[PDB]
Design brief:
Layout (H helix, E strand, L loop, with lengths): L2 H11 L10 E4 L20 H9 L7 H11 L6 E5 L5 H12 L9 E4 L3 H14 L8 E4 L15 E4 L1 H8 L12 E4 L2 H4 L3 H13 L5 E6 L4 H10 L4 E5 L9 E7 L3 H12 L5 E5 L2 H13 L5 E3 L5 H12 L5 E5 H4 L9 E4 L12 H7 L5 E7 L2 H14 L4 E2 L5 H8 L1
Parallel strand pairs: 2-7, 2-8, 3-5, 3-6, 4-5, 6-7, 9-14, 9-15, 10-12, 10-13, 11-12, 13-14
Antiparallel strand pairs: 1-8
The protein binds phosphoaminophosphonic acid-adenylate ester and magnesium ion.
Subunit structure: Associates with the nuclear pore complex via interaction with NUP214. Interacts with NUP214 or RNA in a mutually exclusive manner.
InterPro entries: DEAD/DEAH_box_helicase_dom (IPR011545), Helicase_ATP-bd (IPR014001), Helicase_C-like (IPR001650), P-loop_NTPase (IPR027417), RNA_helicase_DEAD_Q_motif (IPR014014)
GO molecular function, one term: ATP binding
């Protein structure tokens, strides 16, 4: 639920590319045509002011996905593209670079159009445009979003437009703010998020149908879900397709344990004995009340922990995650919802204060694999009722790797796991 907020949070805390060891699968529209992949930005002959912006942003080498996407997007005649790769692989930097290659800042009208699922996500993309194109003196950016106060009769002179589908459609047709036949590059970013809203699909297609045939069409998604793929086929005609499989999570270098408990207050005491061993840790709870209650009790017992709860704005969650990464916080308590799909790094211990279960009540094996884990990690699961023990064993059955019973009372066994 709310993929747009999860996506926004990952943007705010993302500091570098995610390392992927898989290979890029390329499906060109012409299977006879060769596969051209570059390994440096000089190989692309970018405009000097654009290469300057690329280097000024700390980029020195194309990312894995960019090695194939950049030469394909800069080829003549323009090639359309549907690209799929996990968050943090450089999809956004890729199409920003493509947009900045085709824009002529002397022509004071929109030439590149990008659709974002939300205003906040549009702002994140606009920041990348502002950075990479900061050596384009006359280059200006317009935000076609609901909050924009624009009186009729004006014709926007910004060369790049980022916006949400509803407002962009109004600007291109009804309100006559954009002439769509002058658009040279069209991007639909975060298609996996965009489809979460019913109206967005129809609006995005209607916008695309107004563009000229010589306009380059680009679509990017974090996931390869069939619904996104079917939507993408309706948006991008005659597409090349690029895919980078998500980096697998092995689970083999992590010691798993579970603690039988009589009640909740037992789980708190059992957690206290463990805390001595540690080595930042994340603690996952089902309800905000559990997370708030647990975070408070840990403070009373002499330890400061960061809390991740739903009343916090996305910007506050990012600030807490950043402090946790910088070591200022040694332990982070979070609900399942606030942590679902968030790429938190620098975690070596996971405490499943509550076992991850889907809305069907069954085990959430996907969430379990994502939280845990080639560096040694530790996973402690807190069982309470017999139901929870029935669940835990189903997890143990799923992965077929044993979760040894930890005896929280015995401090000697706690040192054994710490090894
Ligand atoms: N060629 C590059 N070299 C180094 N860092 C890069 C490069 N391209 C992008 N990055 C960085 O890698 C991170 C992810 O880049 P970004 O373009 O936002 O990825 P993404 O695939 O669009 N993410 P998402 O929109 O959440 O699916 C950011 O910190 C970028 O600054
Ligand atoms: Mg992206």
């Amino acid at each position: 639920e709310d993929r747009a907020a999860q996506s926004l949070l990952n943007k705010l805390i993302r500091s570098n590319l995610v390392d992927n060891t898989n290979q890029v699968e390329v499906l060109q529209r012409d299977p006879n045509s060769p596969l051209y992949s570059v390994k440096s930005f000089e190989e692309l002959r970018l405009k000097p002011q654009l290469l300057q912006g690329v280097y000024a942003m700390g980029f020195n080498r194309p990312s894995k996905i960019q090695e194939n996407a950049l030469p394909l997007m800069l080829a003549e005649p323009p090639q359309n593209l549907i690209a799929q790769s996990q968050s943090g692989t450089g999809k956004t930097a890729a199409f920003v670079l493509a947009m900045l290659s085709q824009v002529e800042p002397a022509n004071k009208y929109p030439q590149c159009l990008c659709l974002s699922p939300t205003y906040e996500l549009a702002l994140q993309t606009g920041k990348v445009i502002e950075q990479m194109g900061k050596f384009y003196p006359e280059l200006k950016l317009a935000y076609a979003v609901r909050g924009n106060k624009l009186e009729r009769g004006q014709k926007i002179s910004e060369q790049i437009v980022i916006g949400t589908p509803g407002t962009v459609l109004d600007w291109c047709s009804k309100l006559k703010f954009i002439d769509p036949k002058k658009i040279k590059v069209f991007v639909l970013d975060e298609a996996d998020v965009m489809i979460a809203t019913q109206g967005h699909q129809d609006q995005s297609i209607r916008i695309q149908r107004m563009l000229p045939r010589n306009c380059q069409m680009l679509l990017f998604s974090a996931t390869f879900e069939d619904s996104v793929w079917k939507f993408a086929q309706k948006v991008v005609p005659d597409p090349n397709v690029i895919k980078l499989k998500r980096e697998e999570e092995t689970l083999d270098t992590i010691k798993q344990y579970y603690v039988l408990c009589s009640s909740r207050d037992e789980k708190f005491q059992a957690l206290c004995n463990l805390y001595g061993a540690i080595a930042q840790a994340m603690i996952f709870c089902h309800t905000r009340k559990t997370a708030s209650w647990l975070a408070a009790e840990l403070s009373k017992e002499g330890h400061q922990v960061a809390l991740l709860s739903g009343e916090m704005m996305v910007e506050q969650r990012a600030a807490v995650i950043e402090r946790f990464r910088e070591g200022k916080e040694k332990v982070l308590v979070t609900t399942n919802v606030c942590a679902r799909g968030i790429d938190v790094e620098q975690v070596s211990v996971v405490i499943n204060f509550d076992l991850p279960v889907d809305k069907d009540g069954n085990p959430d094996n996907e969430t379990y694999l994502h939280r845990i884990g080639g560096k040694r990690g530790l996973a402690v699961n807190m069982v309470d009722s017999k139901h929870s023990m029935n669940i835990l064993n189903r997890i143990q059955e799923h992965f077929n790797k044993k979760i040894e019973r930890l005896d929280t009372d015995d401090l000697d066994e706690i040192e054994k796991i710490a090894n």
